């Protein structure tokens, strides 16, 4: 029905996703890197608490070492958060560079194929009319289905990717809460004798 | 006994200097690592702010329902970053700065040990010089009397100093224990508060992202 409008609609949708998913990808990747750098410093904190504990009196040494044990455990969970974020948030967003490329390549091929084939006067005009009618019908069916699928998949994927980010963070914060709730007690039960 | 007071003065001096050096080394290391931890937490907060901005920028381009859901998620995530910033500031105030104060506490302890040791060095010179004088004129009634006066005074000063050292050691250690418990209790409480707020924000954000395809 409207080739200029369907074409523009598809190019605008794929280009918008390309730009914004690509930007989300690199910021998520940076967020993951910063999370790992925080985990490095927490690891140094584990090592120093144990090194100081080693020099101290029994009750204080024990309480600090027990706290270091919990805090070290938390940093294994942080490392697992780091790895799940890269696997389930960053990598799927990076995959959209390829999806967008395939969508553009299919649009170009769609219009090139119908063009290649196209390349008395009344009979010639009738054959070209018939061909144009067939191609208009097939191309507009195809463009419509490509647009509708792209948009449905983009929504599914956005929901998945942000739902995974949120799930991964909730699980880490949930573990952190229960570790810190435990660690509080053994710092508090360091007997001042 | 004088033998015991002089021995206990020397043992307490060594005990205090060893403890002061230990606290200095390890509290100073904790100080700079906690400070680095706070900095990395702020750097993560920076990256999260940029994500807020890009989620909003992408939402601005989108269809009604999807725009609404993404901007709602960005608001929640931005509020989380305000809590992270408050975590950063409280860690600095209640964990890093109390550890940093120990550089001053340690400096004051060392200055006092140095002051005591220079006084003891001056007194020891005086005492050995007086004994050299006595050996060179041992029947001098006035040197005999100076020596008797110096014996009593040094004995009294040894007792007062070891009494001083004992209270200084006991205060430093009692305070060190109180402070380390306070500092680690604050760190845990501050994090536990952030993690609880984060869990509560994400639980809301999760439920709302799921209605995005509606």
XYZ file of C-alpha atoms in Angstrom:
407
model
C 0.000 0.000 0.000
C 2.714 2.555 0.948
C 6.330 1.623 0.165
C 7.954 4.924 1.173
C 6.288 4.852 4.593
C 6.987 1.182 5.331
C 10.634 1.567 4.285
C 11.116 4.644 6.452
C 9.278 3.026 9.367
C 11.665 0.018 9.285
C 14.863 2.018 8.826
C 13.819 4.380 11.644
C 13.035 1.500 14.014
C 16.210 -0.464 13.316
C 18.403 2.668 13.552
C 16.868 3.799 16.842
C 17.439 0.378 18.425
C 20.952 0.204 16.988
C 21.941 3.529 18.577
C 20.244 3.094 21.922
C 20.879 -0.601 22.499
C 24.481 0.043 21.562
C 24.709 2.863 24.093
C 23.027 0.728 26.769
C 25.500 -2.045 26.005
C 28.561 0.036 26.664
C 27.203 1.682 29.854
C 26.126 -1.686 31.250
C 29.587 -2.984 30.379
C 31.089 -0.039 32.317
C 28.750 -0.621 35.233
C 29.930 -4.238 35.311
C 33.588 -3.140 35.225
C 33.051 -0.714 38.109
C 31.310 -3.499 40.060
C 34.392 -5.686 39.516
C 36.730 -2.869 40.626
C 34.667 -2.471 43.822
C 35.026 -6.261 44.342
C 38.831 -5.901 43.996
C 38.927 -3.331 46.803
C 36.659 -5.439 48.991
C 39.110 -8.312 48.444
C 41.929 -6.097 49.698
C 39.727 -5.345 52.710
C 39.298 -9.074 53.416
C 43.057 -9.546 53.317
C 43.830 -6.618 55.641
C 41.173 -7.516 58.258
C 42.681 -11.000 58.501
C 46.227 -9.593 58.601
C 45.257 -7.226 61.432
C 43.235 -9.918 63.204
C 46.305 -12.168 63.236
C 48.056 -9.647 65.525
C 45.250 -9.285 68.055
C 43.823 -10.798 71.226
C 41.687 -13.975 70.925
C 38.151 -12.536 71.112
C 39.018 -9.655 68.764
C 40.998 -11.881 66.409
C 38.140 -14.390 66.185
C 35.410 -11.810 65.625
C 37.382 -10.030 62.916
C 38.300 -13.255 61.151
C 34.669 -14.402 61.237
C 33.628 -11.067 59.758
C 36.336 -11.441 57.128
C 34.965 -14.901 56.306
C 31.454 -13.519 55.698
C 32.710 -10.488 53.774
C 34.863 -12.726 51.571
C 31.785 -14.840 50.856
C 29.877 -11.740 49.802
C 32.636 -10.955 47.285
C 32.220 -14.360 45.660
C 28.550 -13.475 45.257
C 29.539 -10.106 43.814
C 31.824 -11.863 41.323
C 28.870 -14.085 40.337
C 26.755 -10.950 39.877
C 29.501 -9.513 37.680
C 29.553 -12.617 35.513
C 25.783 -12.916 35.179
C 25.429 -9.251 34.199
C 27.941 -9.676 31.369
C 26.368 -12.960 30.237
C 22.711 -11.931 30.453
C 22.611 -8.167 29.968
C 25.692 -6.973 28.130
C 26.060 -9.816 25.643
C 22.356 -9.805 24.491
C 22.552 -6.054 23.912
C 25.748 -6.509 21.921
C 23.963 -9.179 19.844
C 21.586 -6.480 18.535
C 24.335 -5.008 16.357
C 24.100 -8.202 14.343
C 20.284 -8.274 14.386
C 20.105 -4.704 13.092
C 22.650 -5.524 10.384
C 20.638 -8.542 9.190
C 17.435 -6.448 9.113
C 19.047 -3.757 6.960
C 20.659 -6.364 4.685
C 17.255 -8.034 4.180
C 15.588 -4.713 3.322
C 18.280 -3.910 0.731
C 18.135 -7.441 -0.706
C 14.311 -7.270 -0.785
C 14.390 -4.098 -2.946
C 17.408 -5.253 -5.037
C 15.828 -8.624 -5.946
C 12.549 -7.126 -7.124
C 14.702 -4.553 -8.988
C 17.080 -7.083 -10.616
C 14.101 -9.076 -12.003
C 12.438 -5.879 -13.339
C 15.639 -5.025 -15.323
C 4.723 -3.625 -28.880
C 4.723 -0.959 -26.170
C 1.213 -1.876 -24.946
C 2.103 -5.509 -24.277
C 5.328 -4.483 -22.510
C 3.402 -2.057 -20.292
C 0.872 -4.732 -19.346
C 3.611 -7.187 -18.359
C 5.321 -4.515 -16.249
C 1.964 -3.618 -14.680
C 1.329 -7.222 -13.749
C 4.885 -7.587 -12.334
C 4.594 -4.345 -10.359
C 1.292 -5.495 -8.882
C 2.762 -8.844 -7.784
C 5.845 -7.234 -6.288
C 3.865 -4.527 -4.536
C 1.658 -7.170 -2.924
C 4.552 -9.451 -1.907
C 6.855 -6.649 -0.714
C 4.264 -4.855 1.375
C 3.259 -8.166 3.022
C 6.944 -8.811 3.777
C 7.774 -5.338 5.035
C 4.733 -5.389 7.289
C 5.680 -8.746 8.779
C 9.338 -7.726 9.209
C 8.355 -4.498 10.995
C 5.805 -6.224 13.204
C 8.161 -9.063 14.166
C 11.084 -6.676 14.781
C 9.001 -4.530 17.084
C 7.499 -7.534 18.945
C 10.949 -9.079 19.410
C 12.496 -5.770 20.503
C 9.881 -5.454 23.265
C 10.365 -9.057 24.334
C 14.109 -8.553 24.417
C 13.972 -5.267 26.321
C 11.709 -6.882 28.890
C 14.078 -9.883 29.201
C 17.244 -7.839 29.471
C 15.983 -5.400 32.100
C 14.237 -8.213 33.945
C 17.548 -10.137 34.081
C 19.439 -7.029 35.276
C 16.873 -6.528 38.011
C 16.810 -10.214 38.944
C 20.622 -10.414 39.147
C 20.807 -7.314 41.349
C 17.962 -8.443 43.614
C 19.677 -11.774 44.207
C 22.969 -10.057 45.121
C 21.281 -7.529 47.400
C 19.335 -10.354 49.013
C 22.507 -12.308 49.839
C 24.320 -9.147 51.001
C 21.531 -8.396 53.448
C 21.691 -11.828 55.030
C 25.503 -11.795 55.185
C 25.654 -8.354 56.815
C 22.830 -9.317 59.183
C 24.986 -12.244 60.342
C 28.292 -10.355 60.392
C 26.811 -7.662 62.647
C 26.349 -10.163 65.470
C 29.876 -11.565 65.667
C 31.388 -8.092 65.567
C 28.979 -7.222 68.392
C 29.723 -10.405 70.392
C 33.462 -9.714 70.467
C 33.869 -10.116 74.246
C 35.797 -7.100 75.546
C 37.885 -9.553 77.624
C 60.825 -3.029 95.095
C 62.932 -0.772 92.938
C 64.181 -3.703 90.787
C 60.553 -4.493 89.893
C 59.497 -0.868 89.255
C 62.382 -0.217 86.837
C 61.666 -3.518 85.061
C 57.963 -2.763 84.834
C 58.684 0.734 83.499
C 60.777 -0.767 80.674
C 58.233 -3.484 79.865
C 55.281 -1.075 79.645
C 57.244 1.322 77.428
C 57.988 -1.579 75.064
C 54.394 -2.823 75.327
C 52.966 0.615 74.446
C 55.293 1.280 71.500
C 54.537 -2.151 69.997
C 50.786 -1.623 70.273
C 50.949 1.956 68.948
C 52.961 0.787 65.928
C 50.550 -2.094 65.282
C 47.501 0.165 65.409
C 49.257 2.696 63.183
C 50.179 0.146 60.525
C 46.838 -1.696 60.375
C 44.391 1.140 61.076
C 46.214 3.149 58.402
C 45.921 0.274 55.936
C 42.207 -0.144 56.734
C 41.808 3.604 56.332
C 43.206 3.723 52.798
C 41.403 0.523 51.651
C 38.056 1.637 53.056
C 38.651 4.998 51.379
C 39.335 3.202 48.077
C 36.209 1.114 48.597
C 34.201 4.321 49.016
C 35.746 5.757 45.845
C 34.881 2.686 43.792
C 31.360 2.777 45.188
C 31.107 6.392 43.964
C 32.549 5.425 40.554
C 29.830 2.717 40.279
C 27.260 5.351 41.230
C 28.619 7.506 38.347
C 28.068 4.716 35.850
C 24.596 4.076 37.202
C 23.712 7.753 36.724
C 24.772 7.526 33.046
C 22.539 4.485 32.702
C 19.668 6.451 34.164
C 20.285 9.092 31.496
C 20.506 6.625 28.587
C 17.438 4.677 29.706
C 15.590 8.007 29.715
C 17.065 8.979 26.333
C 15.949 5.716 24.758
C 12.488 5.858 26.409
C 11.973 9.335 24.934
C 12.060 7.767 21.445
C 9.603 4.986 22.108
C 5.900 4.123 21.923
C 3.633 5.168 24.828
C 3.509 2.069 27.046
C 7.195 1.226 26.581
C 8.277 4.830 27.192
C 6.226 4.926 30.385
C 7.706 1.675 31.718
C 11.296 2.618 30.945
C 11.024 6.123 32.446
C 9.405 4.609 35.517
C 12.316 2.195 35.820
C 14.817 5.039 35.323
C 13.180 7.017 38.180
C 13.423 4.030 40.537
C 17.031 3.358 39.549
C 17.876 7.064 39.973
C 16.392 7.022 43.470
C 18.633 4.016 44.212
C 21.610 6.116 43.146
C 20.644 8.818 45.641
C 20.753 6.093 48.305
C 24.129 4.915 47.035
C 25.400 8.489 47.261
C 24.192 8.650 50.861
C 25.947 5.309 51.490
C 29.162 6.826 50.076
C 28.895 9.895 52.307
C 28.116 7.942 55.474
C 30.971 5.480 54.886
C 33.317 8.482 54.549
C 32.000 10.146 57.685
C 31.622 7.126 60.000
C 34.238 4.614 58.803
C 37.035 6.386 56.906
C 37.302 9.535 59.046
C 37.408 7.705 62.464
C 40.182 5.463 61.113
C 42.004 8.555 59.815
C 41.787 10.148 63.268
C 44.024 7.329 64.441
C 46.943 8.935 62.620
C 46.625 11.800 65.078
C 46.036 9.564 68.096
C 49.120 7.579 67.123
C 51.136 10.765 66.587
C 50.213 12.012 70.082
C 51.239 8.683 71.613
C 54.607 8.764 69.848
C 55.313 12.384 70.843
C 54.677 11.489 74.468
C 56.960 8.432 74.310
C 59.656 10.605 72.708
C 59.173 13.238 75.426
C 59.464 10.622 78.176
C 62.546 9.085 76.593
C 64.387 12.400 76.262
C 63.562 13.198 79.881
C 64.832 9.784 80.955
C 68.007 10.359 78.900
C 68.661 13.701 80.631
C 68.045 12.156 84.073
C 70.289 9.192 83.276
C 73.109 11.569 82.282
C 72.648 13.493 85.505
C 72.671 10.302 87.583
C 75.734 8.801 85.962
C 77.578 12.144 86.204
C 76.783 12.354 89.918
C 78.109 8.836 90.453
C 81.294 9.820 88.602
C 81.637 12.803 90.986
C 81.123 10.587 94.035
C 83.838 8.175 92.844
C 86.250 11.137 92.516
C 85.453 12.672 95.956
C 83.668 9.903 97.909
C 83.920 11.578 101.361
C 82.235 14.827 100.209
C 79.228 15.129 102.528
C 77.369 17.273 100.020
C 77.813 14.785 97.160
C 76.727 11.992 99.475
C 73.630 14.033 100.272
C 72.978 14.771 96.574
C 73.276 11.058 95.817
C 70.809 10.167 98.605
C 68.382 12.804 97.323
C 68.693 11.551 93.737
C 68.192 7.908 94.769
C 64.859 8.721 96.483
C 63.664 10.948 93.657
C 64.469 8.473 90.850
C 62.681 5.752 92.816
C 59.581 7.911 93.169
C 59.668 8.926 89.485
C 59.935 5.274 88.366
C 56.792 4.370 90.321
C 54.805 7.341 89.045
C 55.855 6.670 85.453
C 54.959 2.995 85.489
C 51.594 3.933 87.056
C 51.240 6.435 84.207
C 52.223 3.904 81.564
C 49.759 1.338 82.888
C 46.813 3.720 82.608
C 47.958 4.929 79.176
C 48.184 1.351 77.884
C 44.823 0.436 79.376
C 43.071 3.539 77.997
C 44.581 3.106 74.537
C 43.548 -0.566 74.325
C 40.074 -0.045 75.772
C 39.482 2.812 73.326
C 40.999 0.862 70.409
C 38.548 -1.987 71.052
C 35.590 0.363 71.450
C 36.499 2.206 68.223
C 37.136 -0.857 66.060
C 33.790 -2.314 67.126
C 32.084 1.017 66.384
C 33.808 1.321 63.023
C 32.962 -2.172 61.796
C 29.462 -1.867 63.228
C 28.913 1.358 61.300
C 30.251 -0.180 58.053
C 27.875 -3.144 58.406
C 24.891 -1.034 59.389
C 25.510 1.433 56.530
C 25.743 -1.360 53.931
C 22.800 -3.295 55.325
C 20.733 -0.141 55.045
C 21.770 0.361 51.422
C 21.169 -3.287 50.492
C 17.707 -3.202 52.075
C 16.694 -0.054 50.198
C 18.096 -1.526 46.949
C 16.149 -4.773 47.384
C 13.007 -2.755 48.053
C 13.553 -0.565 44.972
C 14.310 -3.480 42.665
C 11.319 -5.479 43.897
C 9.070 -2.619 42.799
C 11.058 -2.125 39.573
C 10.778 -5.824 38.683
C 6.976 -5.923 39.018
C 6.643 -2.809 36.893
C 9.035 -3.872 34.096
C 6.927 -7.022 33.709
C 3.796 -4.988 32.793
C 5.714 -3.284 29.986
C 4.355 -5.540 27.227
C 0.731 -4.834 28.326
